Every structure is written in C-alpha cells, then in structure tokens.
Amino acid sequence: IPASEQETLVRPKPLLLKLLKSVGAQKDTYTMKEVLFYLGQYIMTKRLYDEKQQHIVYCSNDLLGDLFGVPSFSVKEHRKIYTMIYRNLVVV
Numbered sequence: 001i002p003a004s005e006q007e008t009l010v011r012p013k014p015l016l017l018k019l020l021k022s023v024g025a026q027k028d029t030y031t032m033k034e035v036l037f038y039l040g041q042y043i044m045t046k047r048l049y050d051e052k053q054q055h056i057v058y059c060s061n062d063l064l065g066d067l068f069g070v071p072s073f074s075v076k077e078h079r080k081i082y083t084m085i086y087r088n089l090v091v092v
C-alpha cells in the first residue's frame with residue numbers, strides 16, 4: 001500500500017462512525033491513518049482478533065462483520081481490508 005493512502009481524507013458513514021466512536025473522538029473528517037488505527041483498536045477491544053489464532057479476525061458476531069460484509073478476514077490482506085473500509089465511507 002502506498003504511504004500516501006494514509007493521508008486520504010474520508011467521512012465515515014453512520015454505522016462505521018458508531019464503531020469509531022467507542023475508541024476515538026467524533027470528527028467530521030478522518031484520515032485513513034486514523035480510521036485504520038481506530039478499527040484496529042476496536043477489533044482488539046471486542047476480542048475479534050487474537051494473536052494466538054493466525055492472522056484471522058472473526059467478526060460474524062459483531063457490527064464490524066455487518067459493515068465488512070464478511071464473517072472473517074486476514075489481517076495480512078491489506079488491499080482487501082481497504083476495499084472493505086471504502087464500502088463504509090465517503091471520500092472528501
């Protein structure tokens with residue numbers, strides 16, 4: 001992933017904002033760097049990812065799964081993750 005993508009400005013849709021607000025401050029605009037940071041922290045706070053289980057995030061029992069439209073995914077497949085995140089925001 002190119003470093004410049006981290007500076008991309010986005011506006012999370014309602015339900016993704018709901019998720020982001022349990023770990024970060026509400027903002028009109030976020031950078032992708034922030035969105036990934038917060039999503040990563042959120043994932044850990046709800047036990048969706050455990051280090052002992054091989055890079056897979058299980059989210060079928062959480063709002064994250066609803067938004068990403070998948071029951072689980074690899075933390076190593078970054079391009080896919082970005083695609084899943086773009087389903088839930090509007091670019092500024």
Ligand SMILES: C[C@]1(CC(=O)O)C[C@H](c2cccc(Cl)c2)[C@@H](c2ccc(Cl)cc2)N([C@H](CS(=O)(=O)N2CCCC2)C2CC2)C1=O
Binds near residue numbers: 043057076078082
């Ligand atoms: C270390 C990493 C996996 C890896 O590349 O080896 C990085 C990952 C990440 C970071 C930046 C962009 C992207 Cl697309 C993914 C990132 C991540 C962030 C958001 C999503 Cl949606 C998916 C994966 N996480 C989370 C933990 S973490 O890096 O936030 N943090 C490290 C120590 C404890 C918490 C995994 C939990 C979701 C990872 O485990």
